[PDB]
UniProtKB/Swiss-Prot annotation, chain D:
It catalyses: ATP + H2O + 4 H(+)(in) = ADP + phosphate + 5 H(+)(out). It comes from Citrus unshiu (Satsuma mandarin). Belongs to the ATPase alpha/beta chains family. Keywords: ATP-binding, Hydrogen ion transport, Ion transport, Nucleotide-binding, Translocase, Transport. This is V-type proton ATPase catalytic subunit A. The keyword Electron transport does not apply. Catalytic subunit of the peripheral V1 complex of vacuolar ATPase. V-ATPase vacuolar ATPase is responsible for acidifying a variety of intracellular compartments in eukaryotic cells. V-ATPase is a heteromultimeric enzyme composed of a peripheral catalytic V1 complex (main components: subunits A, B, C, D, E, and F) attached to an integral membrane V0 proton pore complex (main component: the proteolipid protein). ATP binds at G44, A45, F46, G47, C48, G49, K50, T51. The keyword ATP-binding applies. The chain holds residues 209 to 623 of 623 of the full protein. Its EC number is 7.1.2.2. GO terms for biological process: ATP metabolic process. One of its GO terms (cellular component) is plant-type vacuole. GO terms for molecular function: ATP binding; ATP hydrolysis activity; proton-transporting ATPase activity, rotational mechanism.
Length: 603, 467, 52, 415
């Protein structure tokens, strides 16, 4: 239909478009590299290649697909690997025995031929149906019940509903009548990669994410269907925190969409998806591959794919949230995504605003990060899901005033700022307890009250102790520990106890692999109770003794409790919640006995 | 392959500026079409088509633009991208920047032609770094170890012996599994690519590899500083293609040494300025990250073949910094970083590796029961903790005074001194085993008391504290 | 002895620490502005002229 | 014969150079030596007057021919050169009086001359150097103020609207400067007989504002082998060479190991010890400034001593007095050996002195009782080289042996 005029890397001009649609996908050249329009100039158009562009020719045909970028939504997406162009990588590797990905390969996102069982939800002929009505369910695998739903822009009366049976994707199962037309339907539905899926209503979040890490779960809680921000450091986080979301998270599904990353890390993690099963179900061991989907685009991938992959991932997440399942989206991108925006702006010759980043970076980041929340779905029956976003930014070593970082912290409510010093200190969680913050605190008030009313005050006390330690660290560095008082001494002891027992979670050991909230709250309660008892003891300071003398005494006389407070970390959660609660209650009772007999002896 | 076509030959050179020549009235110009330039004097230069638009076509020239004129410059369009010849016979030879042999021998009789920037590997078919190798350097081997298929860049500045340590690593490259490892397939088949290096460094590397006895194994691609700049942007790509063939289609473990990535960034900046695009950070081209990603992501193990590629790209910090775009992007991409510190050089330690910023993201997978002792990770964690606490203690002692320092403070200072003296320092022609090296690390650790070794678990403490 | 040590520390701070850090801040500001801002604006102007 | 100036004259082969460049200045000759045909860089910020060092090298180097080129150099300097070289004589083995002006050619065009000609000037200079190299002679070229060449590139590129990559300097700066420096070396000449000439390049990169982070300085330091770091601190203190030991570095130390071994095996050890002493002196100066003169270790006192002597005597040359105008290598080795041997004797005394008092605490008393010998050590530099090699070597032997005997006897006394 049209022919190329100008080729410069990802940018390819195609004269002869005349009537063409903004962001309409167009195939370029004999190999048919799929690309989207970015800049109309008249009859001419500008197309990002989305592939390797070497070897084009002037007058090579360019065809219009007339449709914007879309990803095939349907049964069979779970446990699959897709590029930003929604290409099943394992399917490509199997169909074509060559280890490479051939240039301009055209493979359907989901195999039509593959069979799947069906289960209508007592649907009757002639019933009026609306978009998003969960008329039937399909078990893609154990513990995964894909409830097929009507497309959002679809409604009518059910003239025909298929009986339950084995069907391929190309097969039609549902027929609707509306306004005197008949509309057939297959399981697979297409949805634009932009323009988020419609939502009946947005709801205020109520439940925390309850991640394995202690600091993430207590100091900086995050609600279900809420934004997150991590600096994407190595060693931990994108390896540790990500593993915690993958197997230790209460989210039903994980959509890992890493883009612009180290290739070997994704090779390893893809080798890890089939393995590393988690026995979350009572009677079965849920292999994480069932509850994950990898959108993998390594650094060698084309630049436009770096922009496309994020929207593909968020579209998949919105799809899953439509069924009511709570799904988490971890994104190792948005670090290199800004670089991709810089590149496309530079080729398009747009004028950058700050440090070479195009201005609409902030707007696009705001859109993507606001595409997540707790949502009441469309159709019947009434159901509710959520999407939780965890997106990386520049590594913590660089300045946190970087435009991408500044844009993210504007909209993101929870920043889990990792510390380079902590990483060098080999402190594995590496979460800084000063820069990090979770604005979601006020919402979780009811949850914390119903769980444990005393938790709020002890958390505030722990925060105050940490702040005091950080504040007077400068003083003790300058002046010295000689002037430190008994209150300062117990404050430093409690701060060290926190830094060692509480904020540190190795996660490579069964006792530290996962820390349930009940164990975390008890450990914090024990630490705060010990701090309070020490405060009261040094405050009493009577009987020709006490204060710093009392502090030294309780350091030596009550050294056993202080030592086993550290071992409280080693208490194995697998032993069972009632046993751990009993053990911690006994420890608390002994701590109360401590500083009470020490009170009786009056030093 | 029914019938072929002879390449066109144009004389329409409407503009020659910088390293670029602007052709016109050309028909059917491919992108990245490789052109041969016949000057009026008859000498032949080869170049590439950087951009295609209408009948115009911007052509970059590899060998410079010091003889082109409108009247007599003739240019041909071969209608294909660069495809360097490759074969097993390419081993044990030295080549110019463009791949033209300079070993006074004959040109390569190709086994096949491979398009540069080879086909992308399906990510679902790559594999994690499986085995680990002994690098000889104590600092490299004991901490932030290098596994097969890893991407460990050495970070150095002007004057620091990055070339010397690169040569050392090449001679000391070896397997480590249970200290067991003819091994012709296991032979590392080092591919060395030097870009914009002083002639002295070139002769140094040449003599070092000639005397090493691996002249039948290594392969050198040189692009000296006096050589044309444009040639340098292809040399690492040629090296990557040769490594990919000799590794994947030939079943040999291959190690890659890229030299002076800053020089490559310089060529990229020169090309961008000549083409007059919008800059990035510090005037660099905005797509430099994509170029570095493509130049780095071409290494790693592959499921379908027995080969593997492990690359060690030495990088020159321009002003001895990291915020510079090139080291920053390299850190963004590469899964490791080894630092050579000017402070260490000031005290005259031949390996100046600063262990504190050094890190390997795949070090945990690299170390294993077969690879090392089970307590190797504990040793590394303890060494990190001790070094960090010792640096903080040294600062505290400096600010408060030497006498005011506590006993543990002087212990940490003594640990720092002994570590930086015995451990980091190593000989120039001397390699070393891993297991007794870990024993010496335990000696440095047991200098500290058992109680202070909180980072090490008690089990490994009982295992290897006394010894 | 304590007063001598403290006075020495304070005088050393006032005479060396601040007197070295303030020039460091001044040099950092001067370099950052007069290089990055100036050259970025010049690049933008050159690009604008190219388009013009 | 006419040669395209830009193109580099052909060479049969390029070979490793192993003949040190004898500058005649102790600091550059010993601390940071250069090989004949090597590449050097002298920043020389404003006011340091690097041209006196360049002129001294031109006068007293062992080169067969000198090609001095100044791009952007002030006219007075060229007048001074042309007026003073003919009278100054160099002594060959025949010994007859001869003017270095015959040995030297000047390609310089003053700062008033048009800027576009800076490139042409530097390339003509280097091609004349190469021409003399092909003749079998060992020639050295000095390129005054290549920063003016960089400014010429910026001005020319600015008119062409070529995009400023960094600080106005065009992108293709490192490439051209690299080619210019790369034309240097030691080569086997073409034709018969089998000449082996060389070209030595010692350029100058004046830092605007005295910050070595400057682009031209950065590229030079990137591509230079031996680097001599001029600093404003020593220049203000009227040190005269103003060659800072810390920043300066030589990559040619490994190559000249054979020459040093055949000359004197002691040289390597004494050089390393002097470097260590200087580094320790800097560290101790920082520590003392942080803490104070008091609480200073006796061993640290001995280290700071004779390091002050190094700075005052060996590392400094007047460069305008007959004795310090030219420093022969042997007397430099003797002075360095005297300094290190005094330091080693002090260390031995600290090790054993019949108690910690006499060993190290009485280092002040040792200085009091050894004052004459220490004054001889500091004055050894004052002697002129006109006395001749036998006179200087005999005097240095006498000084070293007298110092050792006096130190041992005083160490024997009360111990």
């Amino acid at each position: 239909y049209g022919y190329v005029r100008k080729v410069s890397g990802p940018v390819v001009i195609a004269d002869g478009m005349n009537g063409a649609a903004m962001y309409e996908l167009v195939r370029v050249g004999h190999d048919n590299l799929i690309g989207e329009i970015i800049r109309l100039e008249g009859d001419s158009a500008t197309i990002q290649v989305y592939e390797e562009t070497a070897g084009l020719m002037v007058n090579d045909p360019v065809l219009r697909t007339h449709k914007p970028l879309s990803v095939e939504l349907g049964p069979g997406i779970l446990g699959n690997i897709f590029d930003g162009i929604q290409r099943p990588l394992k399917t490509i590797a199997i169909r074509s025995g060559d280890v490479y990905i051939p240039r301009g390969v055209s493979v359907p996102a989901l195999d039509k031929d593959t069979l799947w069982e069906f289960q209508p939800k007592k649907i009757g002929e002639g019933d009026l149906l609306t978009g998003g009505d969960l008329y039937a369910t399909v078990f893609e695998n154990s513990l995964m019940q894909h409830h097929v739903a009507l497309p959002p822009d679809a409604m009518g009366k059910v003239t025909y509903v298929a009986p339950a049976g084995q069907y391929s994707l190309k097969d039609t199962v549902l027929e609707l009548e509306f306004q005197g037309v008949k509309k057939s339907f297959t399981m697979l539905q297409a949805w634009p990669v932009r323009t988020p899926r419609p939502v009946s209503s947005k709801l205020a979040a109520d439940t925390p994410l309850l991640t394995g890490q202690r600091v993430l779960d207590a100091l900086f809680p995050s609600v279900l269907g809420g934004t997150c921000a991590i600096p994407g450091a190595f060693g931990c986080g994108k390896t540790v925190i990500s593993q915690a979301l993958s197997k230790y998270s209460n989210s039903d599904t994980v959509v890992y969409v890493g883009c612009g990353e180290r290739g070997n890390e994704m090779a390893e993690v893809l080798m890890d998806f089939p393995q590393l099963t988690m026995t979350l179900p009572d009677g079965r061991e849920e292999s994480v591959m069932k509850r994950t989907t990898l959108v993998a685009n390594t650094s060698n991938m084309p630049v436009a794919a770096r922009e496309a992959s994020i929207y593909t991932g968020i579209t998949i997440a919105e799809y899953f949230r439509d069924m009511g399942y709570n799904v988490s989206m971890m994104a190792d991108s948005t670090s290199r995504w800004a670089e991709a925006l810089r590149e496309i702006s530079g080729r398009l010759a747009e004028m950058p605003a700050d440090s070479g980043y195009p201005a609409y970076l902030a707007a696009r980041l705001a859109s993507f990060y606001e595409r997540a929340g707790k949502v009441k779905c469309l159709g019947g029956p009434e159901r509710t899901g959520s999407v939780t976003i965890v997106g990386a930014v520049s590594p913590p070593g660089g300045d946190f005033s970087d435009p991408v970082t500044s844009a993210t912290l504007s909209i993101v409510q929870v920043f889990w700022g990792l510390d380079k010093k902590l990483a060098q200190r080999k402190h594995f969680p590496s979460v800084n307890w000063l820069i990090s913050y979770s604005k979601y605190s006020t919402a979780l008030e009811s949850f914390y009250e119903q769980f444990d009313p005393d938790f709020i005050n002890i958390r505030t006390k722990a925060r105050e102790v940490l702040q005091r330690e950080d504040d007077l660290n400068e003083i003790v560095q300058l002046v010295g520990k000689d002037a430190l008082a008994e209150g300062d001494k117990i404050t430093l002891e409690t701060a060290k106890l926190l830094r060692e027992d509480y904020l540190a979670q190795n996660a490579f050991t069964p006792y530290d692999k996962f820390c349930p909230f009940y164990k975390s709250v008890w450990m914090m309660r024990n630490i705060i109770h010990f701090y309070n008892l020490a405060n009261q003891a040094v405050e009493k300071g009577a009987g020709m003794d006490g204060q710093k003398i009392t502090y030294t005494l309780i350091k030596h006389r009550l050294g056993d409790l202080f030592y086993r407070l550290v071992s409280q970390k080693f208490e194995d959660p697998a032993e069972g919640e009632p046993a751990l609660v009993a053990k911690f209650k006994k420890l608390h009772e002994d701590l109360t006995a401590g500083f009470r007999a020490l009170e009786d002896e009056t030093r | 392959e029914g019938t072929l076509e002879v390449a066109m030959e144009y004389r329409t050179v409407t503009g020659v500026a910088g390293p670029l020549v602007i052709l016109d009235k050309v028909k059917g110009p491919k992108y990245y079409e490789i052109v041969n330039i016949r000057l009026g004097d008859g000498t032949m230069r080869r170049g590439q088509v950087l951009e295609v638009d209408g009948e115009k076509a911007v052509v970059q020239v590899f060998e410079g633009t010091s003889g082109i004129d409108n009247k007599f410059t003739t240019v041909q369009f071969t209608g294909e991208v660069l495809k360097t010849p490759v074969s097993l016979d390419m081993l044990g030879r030295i080549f110019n920047g463009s791949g033209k042999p300079i070993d006074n021998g004959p040109p390569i009789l190709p086994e096949a032609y491979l398009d540069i920037s080879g086909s992308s590997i399906n990510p679902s078919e790559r594999t994690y770094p499986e085995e680990m190798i002994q690098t000889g350097i104590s600092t490299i081997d004991v901490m932030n170890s290098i596994a097969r298929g890893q991407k460990i860049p050495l970070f150095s500045a002007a004057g620091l012996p990055h070339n010397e340590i690169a040569a050392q690593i090449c001679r000391q490259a070896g397997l480590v599994k249970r200290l067991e490892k003819d091994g012709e397939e296991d032979n590392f088949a080092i591919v060395f690519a030097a870009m914009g290096v002083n002639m002295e460094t070139a002769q140094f590397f040449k003599r070092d590899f000639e005397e090493n006895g691996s002249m039948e194994r290594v392969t050198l691609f040189l692009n000296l500083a006096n050589d044309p700049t444009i040639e340098r942007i292809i040399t690492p790509r040629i090296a990557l293609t040769t490594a990919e063939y000799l590794a994947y289609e030939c079943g040999k473990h291959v190690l890659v040494i890229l030299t002076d990535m800053s020089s490559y960034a310089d060529a990229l900046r020169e090309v961008s300025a000549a083409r007059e695009e919008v800059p990035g950070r510090r005037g660099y081209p905005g797509y430099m990250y994509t170029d570095l990603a493509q130049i780095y992501e071409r290494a790693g193990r592959i499921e379908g073949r027995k080969g593997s590629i492990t690359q060690i790209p030495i990088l020159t910090m321009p002003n001895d910094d990291i915020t510079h775009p090139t080291p920053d992007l390299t850190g963004y991409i590469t899964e490791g970083q080894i630092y050579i510190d000017r402070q260490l050089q000031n005290r005259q330690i031949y390996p100046p590796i600063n262990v504190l910023p050094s890190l390997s993201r795949l070090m945990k997978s690299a170390i294993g029961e077969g690879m090392t002792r089970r307590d190797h990770s504990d040793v590394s964690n303890q060494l990190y903790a001790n070094y960090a606490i010792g640096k903080d203690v040294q600062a505290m002692k400096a600010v408060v005074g030497e006498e005011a320092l506590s006993s543990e403070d002087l212990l940490y200072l003594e640990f720092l001194d002994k570590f930086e003296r015995k451990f980091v320092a190593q000989g120039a022609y001397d390699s070393r085993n891993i297991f007794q090296s870990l024993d010496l690390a335990w000696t440095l650790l047991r200098i500290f008391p058992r109680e202070l070794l909180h980072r090490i678990p008690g089990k490994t403490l009982d295992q290897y504290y006394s010894r | 002895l304590t007063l001598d040590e403290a006075i020495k520390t304070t005088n050393r701070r006032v005479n060396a620490l601040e007197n070295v850090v303030k020039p460091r801040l001044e040099n950092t500001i001067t370099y950052i502005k007069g290089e990055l801002d100036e050259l970025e604006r010049e690049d933008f102007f050159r690009l604008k002229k190219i388009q013009g």
